[PDB]
Amino acid sequence: KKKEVGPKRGSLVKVLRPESYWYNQVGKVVSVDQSGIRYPVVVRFENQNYAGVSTNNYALDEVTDPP
Amino acid sequence: MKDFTTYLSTAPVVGLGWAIFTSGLLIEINRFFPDPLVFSF
Amino acid sequence: AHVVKIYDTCIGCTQCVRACPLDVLEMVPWDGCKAAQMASSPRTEDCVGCKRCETACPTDFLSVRVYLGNESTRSLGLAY
Amino acid sequence: PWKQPELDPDTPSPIFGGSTGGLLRKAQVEEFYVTTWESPKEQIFEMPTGGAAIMRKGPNLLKFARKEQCLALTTQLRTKFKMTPCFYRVYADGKVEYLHPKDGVYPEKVNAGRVGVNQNMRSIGENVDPIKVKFTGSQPFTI
Amino acid sequence: DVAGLTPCSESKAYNKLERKELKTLEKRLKKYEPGSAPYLALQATKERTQNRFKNYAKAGLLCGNDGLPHLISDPGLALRFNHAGEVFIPTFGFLYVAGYIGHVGRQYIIKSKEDAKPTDKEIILDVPLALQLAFQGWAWPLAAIQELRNGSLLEKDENITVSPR
Amino acid sequence: KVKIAVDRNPVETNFEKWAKPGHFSRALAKGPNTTTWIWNLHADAHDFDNHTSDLEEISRKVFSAHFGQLGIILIWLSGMYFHGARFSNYEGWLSDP
Numbered sequence: 001k002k003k004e005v006g007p008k009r010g011s012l013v014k015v016l017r018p019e020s021y022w023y024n025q026v027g028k029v030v031s032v033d034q035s036g037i038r039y040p041v042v043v044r045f046e047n048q049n050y051a052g053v054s055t056n057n058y059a060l061d062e063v064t065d066p067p
Numbered sequence: 068m069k070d071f072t073t074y075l076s077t078a079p080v081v082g083l084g085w086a087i088f089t090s091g092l093l094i095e096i097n098r099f100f101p102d103p104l105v106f107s108f
Numbered sequence: 109a110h111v112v113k114i115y116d117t118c119i120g121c122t123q124c125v126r127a128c129p130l131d132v133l134e135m136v137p138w139d140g141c142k143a144a145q146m147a148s149s150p151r152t153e154d155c156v157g158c159k160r161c162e163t164a165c166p167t168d169f170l171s172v173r174v175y176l177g178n179e180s181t182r183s184l185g186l187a188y
Numbered sequence: 189p190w191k192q193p194e195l196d197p198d199t200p201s202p203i204f205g206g207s208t209g210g211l212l213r214k215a216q217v218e219e220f221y222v223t224t225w226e227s228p229k230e231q232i233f234e235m236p237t238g239g240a241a242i243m244r245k246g247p248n249l250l251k252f253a254r255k256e257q258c259l260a261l262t263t264q265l266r267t268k269f270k271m272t273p274c275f276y277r278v279y280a281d282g283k284v285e286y287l288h289p290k291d292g293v294y295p296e297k298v299n300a301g302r303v304g305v306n307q308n309m310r311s312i313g314e315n316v317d318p319i320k321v322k323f324t325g326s327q328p329f330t331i
Numbered sequence: 332d333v334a335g336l337t338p339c340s341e342s343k344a345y346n347k348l349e350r351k352e353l354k355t356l357e358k359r360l361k362k363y364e365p366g367s368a369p370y371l372a373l374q375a376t377k378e379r380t381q382n383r384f385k386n387y388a389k390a391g392l393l394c395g396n397d398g399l400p401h402l403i404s405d406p407g408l409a410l411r412f413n414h415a416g417e418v419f420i421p422t423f424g425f426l427y428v429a430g431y432i433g434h435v436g437r438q439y440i441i442k443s444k445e446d447a448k449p450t451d452k453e454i455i456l457d458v459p460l461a462l463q464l465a466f467q468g469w470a471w472p473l474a475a476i477q478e479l480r481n482g483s484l485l486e487k488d489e490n491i492t493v494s495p496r
Numbered sequence: 497k498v499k500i501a502v503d504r505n506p507v508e509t510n511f512e513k514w515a516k517p518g519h520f521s522r523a524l525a526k527g528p529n530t531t532t533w534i535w536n537l538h539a540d541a542h543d544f545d546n547h548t549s550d551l552e553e554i555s556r557k558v559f560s561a562h563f564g565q566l567g568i569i570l571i572w573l574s575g576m577y578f579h580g581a582r583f584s585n586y587e588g589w590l591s592d593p
């Protein structure tokens with residue numbers, strides 16, 4: 001399709017999801033799914049959560065630039 | 068040497084070094100200034 | 109019994125079903141995830157609320173949630 | 189699976205002595221669970237209700253008072269020997285219910301034949317506050 | 332003579348406490364021969380006690396009704412009665428040292444984050460870097476207020492991890 | 497049948513593993529990310545049954561740890577005897593116990 005449905009891979013993003021552990025945090029985009037799933041933005045974070053994981057899937061509207 | 072130095076660079080070892088340094092400083096200060104309470108020059 | 113609710117953030121990794129010690133969850137076909145799988149709870153009356161499915165969830169927050177309340181013989185884990 | 193199997197009480201039990209953590213009075217008052225498997229050879233396994241037993245070369249039938257014990261035995265047999273067992277639930281009146289392989293393919297698979305129930309189609313954290321649902325009997329997660 | 336209290340030199344209970352301490356030290360001393368190490372140890376203890384009791388007097392310390400010296404904490408009142416050296420100067424000194432600790436820790440936290448695996452630097456300390464930041468913290472309030480002025484001391488509320496409401 | 501069975505130099509005396517705190521287990525080998533790792537460093541230190549599945553290495557570690565504890569005990573006993581030798585009145589106590 002045209003361009004890409006999400007941000008550039010490898011670029012830093014800021015998570016706007018309030019219920020996420022990484023709210024107002026900077027992560028790295030691993031890959032963006034193009035099939036049309038609800039949360040295609042795979043973000044890897046430097047600091048793990050309480051569960052020990054460091055990756056999560058977010059939608060297009062909850063990612064911004066690192067300010 | 069550098070592996071032993073990085074072992075000495077670990078947090079418990081440098082914390083131990085700080086502990087001996089601060090304890091010895093305070094003990095020598097108390098010994099050579101026996102029981103002070105108020106700063107009077 | 110307890111209430112097991114599964115949201116759309118699930119990626120269909122089947123970890124919650126493997127972590128379930130009473131066979132409550134299941135995998136149904138889906139289109140909202142890359143794995144084309146979605147967790148379901150057709151046997152929520154047998155769930156005791158052990159929250160083992162929540163430990164195995166890899167997503168941030170929880171894609172599966174267990175809410176306790178109205179304990180029964182099956183929900184209290186009683187052999188008597 | 190294609191056809192739901194029917195339990196056979198005449199199937200031989202695995203070689204075992206006496207169990208203390210076995211079926212209580214609830215077995216003759218409420219439902220009790222019964223696990224069946226097909227052992228190709230005789231071997232020693234560990235029951236969740238006590239020590240160790242030896243399964244017979246053929247069909248094997250065991251009885252428990254809790255479904256968690258049945259699934260623990262099922263996953264032990266699947267992880268240790270890849271046995272693929274199945275347990276039923278028998279009530280006091282004799283009603284038999286098929287419990288673990290609902291579609292016969294185990295819940296780890298999909299089979300494209302199960303309808304997903306109790307699935308909220310909104311994201312977690314998007315649920316309404318408890319003030320919004322008050323004096324109605326509906327929980328914020330039940331909508 | 333503030334708070335209805337008398338100076339330690341002018342007080343009677345202070346001298347009574349000193350006399351009682353000297354009496355019990357002499358009672359402990361009389362059980363040993365003069366040519367023994369415990370005798371010299373007790374003589375040194377008595378000398379230290381006498382020096383401490385002399386230094387507590389003629390230094391502005393005051394005691395009330397028990398001979399135990401009291402400390403005045405309000406600034407101004409301690410300034411006009413020469414009691415600032417009791418707590419006022421030590422509190423400023425402790426604030427200086429605590430700011431030294433905070434500035435050194437902040438410098439080590441910031442300076443060990445622009446590298447791969449900062450947790451490794453956190454768990455295995457860069458000893459030359461730690462010593463360099465240790466000897467560079469003598470001007471902690473200047474750097475602290477300058478970081479406050481340029482805004483790098485505080486983080487904005489958009490880059491700060493925040494709990495849901 | 498009973499005989500001495502000894503392997504010659506299985507572990508090299510190097511300080512390269514002293515620099516890495518978490519090395520006995522693969523879970524702690526990835527490095528620390530939370531403070532609960534640090535306690536996990538001081539909790540699974542002597543859990544030799546979890547570090548390796550080989551009984552021989554566990555037995556060798558047990559032998560070495562027992563030797564270390566005997567060395568610690570002998571150090572403590574020697575210190576007790578030294579304190580009795582110098583900073584004590586044992587000779588005075590022998591005259592009138």
Ligand code: CLA
Pocket residue numbers: 077078079082083086454514516517534537538
């Ligand atoms: C001989 C046995 C022994 C003992 C008693 C300890 C004890 C300790 N070590 Mg461990 N350690 C050991 C062997 C031992 N270790 C071995 C063999 C290794 C492998 C090389 C390690 C590797 C190791 C690491 C990598 C770390 C520790 C840390 C710690 C501390 C636990 C965290 C804490 O206190 O909360 C958290 C405590 C704080 C945040 C306070 C920080 C400021 C304090 C006051 C400075 C430290 C001074 C210290 C307490 C006193 C000297 C050390 C003491 C053992 C005598 C504790 C002081 C952690 C640490 O530095 O904590 C101090 C840490 O990061 N140790």
Ligand code: CLA
Pocket residue numbers: 418421422423425426428429430432433436
């Ligand atoms: C020898 C005596 C003695 C001893 C042992 C202590 C011991 C202690 N003090 Mg101190 N204190 C003393 C005397 C003493 N005090 C005196 C005489 C005063 C004057 C009134 C103070 C005033 C004081 C304050 C105001 C604070 C302490 C705090 C502390 C504790 C932690 C220090 C810390 O976090 O590490 C060193 C410090 C850091 C790692 C971080 C730096 C934080 C400092 C306080 C900021 C300094 C700059 C700041 C702008 C000055 C304004 C402070 C603000 C509150 C107005 C520690 C138990 C702190 C505490 O208990 O907080 C929970 C604290 O906030 N003390």
Ligand code: CLA
Pocket residue numbers: 538539540541542543544545
């Ligand atoms: C014959 C002696 C012996 C031996 C060889 C072992 C060996 C072992 N035990 Mg066992 N254990 C023993 C005695 C022994 N234990 C006794 C007497 C008790 C009862 C108290 C226990 C209770 C016990 C439990 C509950 C557990 C073990 C575990 C373990 C394993 C790891 C231990 C470890 O990593 O600790 C590392 C070292 C520490 C954590 C330090 C402990 C320090 C203690 C908590 C405080 C010390 C206080 C000190 C006396 C005073 C300090 C004051 C302070 C101011 C300085 C290992 C197989 C653990 C395991 O996983 O087994 C496989 C485990 O869960 N043991």
Ligand SMILES: CC1=C(/C=C/C(C)=C/C=C/C(C)=C\C=C\C=C(C)\C=C\C=C(C)\C=C\C2=C(C)CCCC2(C)C)C(C)(C)CCC1
Pocket residue numbers: 404405406418419422430433434437475484
């Ligand atoms: C004089 C005096 C007094 C008084 C005092 C007062 C009254 C005070 C107040 C105070 C106050 C009212 C304060 C406030 C504050 C606020 C804020 C807001 C703060 C902040 C801070 C900060 C931020 C800090 C930081 C830091 C750190 C911690 C580390 C590093 C360094 C620094 C410093 C940067 C008394 C009597 C007691 C005693 C004597 C003396």
Ligand code: SF4
Pocket residue numbers: 114117118119120121122123124125146147161164165166167171172
């Ligand atoms: S563990 Fe979580 S993400 Fe994985 S299949 Fe279950 S609900 Fe979905």
Ligand code: SF4
Pocket residue numbers: 112124127128129130131132133154155156157158159160161162174
């Ligand atoms: S709480 Fe336990 S029994 Fe209930 S669905 Fe989760 S894992 Fe299964």
